[PDB]
Protein backbone atom coordinates (compact mmCIF):
# COMPACT_ATOMS: atom_id res chain seq x y z
CA UNK A 1 0.00 0.00 0.00
CA UNK A 2 2.72 2.49 0.95
CA UNK A 3 5.85 1.51 -1.00
CA UNK A 4 26.75 6.98 -5.99
CA UNK A 5 29.62 4.66 -5.09
CA UNK A 6 27.85 1.70 -6.69
CA UNK A 7 27.12 3.76 -9.81
CA UNK A 8 30.77 4.77 -10.12
CA UNK A 9 31.94 1.20 -9.55
CA UNK A 10 29.64 -0.20 -12.24
CA UNK A 11 30.64 2.58 -14.64
CA UNK A 12 34.31 1.75 -14.09
CA UNK A 13 33.60 -1.95 -14.59
CA UNK A 14 31.81 -1.22 -17.86
CA UNK A 15 34.65 1.04 -19.02
CA UNK A 16 37.13 -1.76 -18.26
CA UNK A 17 35.37 -3.76 -21.00
CA UNK A 18 37.34 -1.73 -23.56
CA UNK A 19 40.27 -4.12 -23.02
CA UNK A 20 38.67 -6.65 -25.38
CA UNK A 21 38.17 -3.98 -28.05
CA UNK A 22 41.77 -2.84 -27.67
CA UNK A 23 43.01 -6.42 -27.97
CA UNK A 24 40.93 -6.96 -31.11
CA UNK A 25 42.28 -3.74 -32.64
CA UNK A 26 45.85 -4.76 -31.79
CA UNK A 27 45.31 -8.19 -33.36
CA UNK A 28 43.88 -6.58 -36.50
CA UNK A 29 46.83 -4.19 -36.75
CA UNK A 30 49.29 -7.06 -36.31
CA UNK A 31 47.51 -9.06 -39.02
CA UNK A 32 47.63 -6.07 -41.38
CA UNK A 33 51.34 -5.61 -40.65
CA UNK A 34 52.02 -9.28 -41.39
CA UNK A 35 50.76 -8.70 -44.93
CA UNK A 36 53.47 -6.09 -45.53
CA UNK B 1 34.57 -23.66 -43.52
CA UNK B 2 36.91 -20.68 -43.15
CA UNK B 3 40.15 -21.51 -44.99
CA UNK B 4 53.29 -7.74 -49.95
CA UNK B 5 57.02 -7.25 -50.51
CA UNK B 6 57.54 -10.93 -51.35
CA UNK B 7 54.51 -10.87 -53.66
CA UNK B 8 55.92 -7.85 -55.50
CA UNK B 9 59.36 -9.45 -55.76
CA UNK B 10 57.99 -12.71 -57.18
CA UNK B 11 55.74 -10.82 -59.60
CA UNK B 12 58.71 -8.79 -60.84
CA UNK B 13 60.82 -11.93 -61.21
CA UNK B 14 58.06 -13.67 -63.18
CA UNK B 15 57.63 -10.62 -65.42
CA UNK B 16 61.37 -10.46 -66.09
CA UNK B 17 61.50 -14.18 -66.90
CA UNK B 18 58.52 -13.87 -69.25
CA UNK B 19 60.10 -10.87 -70.98
CA UNK B 20 63.39 -12.73 -71.45
CA UNK B 21 61.58 -15.79 -72.82
CA UNK B 22 59.58 -13.63 -75.23
CA UNK B 23 62.71 -11.84 -76.42
CA UNK B 24 64.48 -15.17 -76.98
CA UNK B 25 61.50 -16.53 -78.92
CA UNK B 26 61.32 -13.38 -81.05
CA UNK B 27 65.05 -13.59 -81.81
CA UNK B 28 64.72 -17.27 -82.73
CA UNK B 29 61.73 -16.58 -85.00
CA UNK B 30 63.76 -14.08 -87.05
CA UNK B 31 64.08 -15.11 -90.68
CA UNK B 32 67.02 -17.42 -91.31
CA UNK B 33 68.05 -15.23 -94.25
CA UNK B 34 68.71 -12.29 -91.91
CA UNK B 35 70.28 -14.56 -89.26
CA UNK B 36 72.99 -15.87 -91.62
CA distances in angstroms from A4 to A11, A16, A22, listed in the order given: 10, 18, 28
Kindly state the greatest CA–CA separation across chain A: 70
Q: What is the resolution of this structure in A?
A: 14.7
For B5, the closest chain A residue by CA position comes to: A36
Which technique was the structure solved with, according to the deposited record? cryo-EM
Q: Say if B5 is an interface residue toward chain A (CB within 8 Å).
A: yes
Query: How many angstroms separate the CA atoms of A5 and A13, rounded?
Result: 12
User: In B, which residues are within 8 Å of A36 by CB distance?
Assistant: 4-5
What sections of A1-36 are H helices per DSSP?
Answer: 5-15, 18-35
CB atoms within 10 A of CB B2: 2
What are the helix (H) ranges across chain B?
5-29, 32-35
Contacts for B4 with CB less than 8 Å, ≥ 6 apart = A35, A36
Range B5-30 burial, b when 16+ CB lie within 10 A, else e: eeeeeeeeeeeeeeeeeeeeeeeeee
Spatial separation of the C-alpha atoms in residues A36 and B29, rounded to whole Å: 42
Length of chain B: 36
Amino acid sequence: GQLEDMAQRRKEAADMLKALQGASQIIAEIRETHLW
